[model samples]
Target: TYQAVLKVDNKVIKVFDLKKDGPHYTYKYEAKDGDYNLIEVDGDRIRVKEANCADLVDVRRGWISKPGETPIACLPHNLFITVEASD
Candidate 1:
């Protein structure tokens, strides 16, 4: 199984099971100052589908599916995303 974990300010905000078989879903994060980002989980991959940050660097990083690939980060929101595998 694989899981996509999302953290904000060093706190676990969302844990998505990538192995689950279902339609694509999304997770929305809203920062204290109203900055927000939308994370999309599709099948065995995850991505920053959209964001309101100034640079949009994280969104440009695209989909992440492997365990050790670089994480997706939205610095403006202190949001981080990582993919981990259990097999």
Candidate 2:
């Protein structure tokens, strides 16, 4: 099993389980432009479904399932996301 952690501005926003066909989570942040990100967890992986950033690097990074993999970063939005093995 695995779990995902979401952080915004260095603050933990959510810690959720990663499973096949998991639910979606939309996080709204009050950054420079006050935007939101749509996240999806599916098939033991997590990804950014949508975001309001200009570069959209985080969304383009695609799904991640490994702890040592590059973490998701929406620099413009100050969002960070990663997956790790669960106890």
Candidate 3:
């Protein structure tokens, strides 16, 4: 199993789990906007699974910058960090 811990504004917020499939790991997480969301980590990146595959892929890889930065209009409204398992 692959697990990721995320923090936003210096607070622990999101956690991710990747199931050990035959070849690749399946991702899963709770659906809710918290302090921050788990995004890509190490070197691998995360993307939104197709609508049909939403159940198979739970948390999409991405980060939300907290209120303090330059406030990009389209960026996430929170700060977050991506920490993934190192192979």
Best-performing candidate as measured by TM-score = 1
Candidate 1 lDDT by residue in tens digits, 1-87: 788889999999788888657459888898778899999988888999999999999999999988889999999889999988764
Q: What CA root-mean-square deviation does each model show from the true structure? A: 1.6, 2.4, 10.0
Task: Measure candidate 2: CA RMSD.
Answer: 2.4
Q: Write the per-residue lDDT of candidate 3 for residues 1-87, one digit (tens) a residue.
A: 344444444566655543333223333323454322224332233332222222322233332222222211212333433435534
| Top lDDT model | 1
Candidate 1, superposed: residue stretches over 4 Å from native: none
Q: For model 1, how many clashes? A: 0
Model 1: worst 10 consecutive residues (lDDT sum)? 14-23
TM-score of 1: 0.90
TM-score of each: 0.90, 0.81, 0.30
TM-score of 3: 0.30
Off by over 4 Å in 3: 22-76
**Candidate 2: tens digits of C-alpha lDDT, residues 38-60:** 88776678888888889889989
Error of 2 at 82 (Å): 0.8
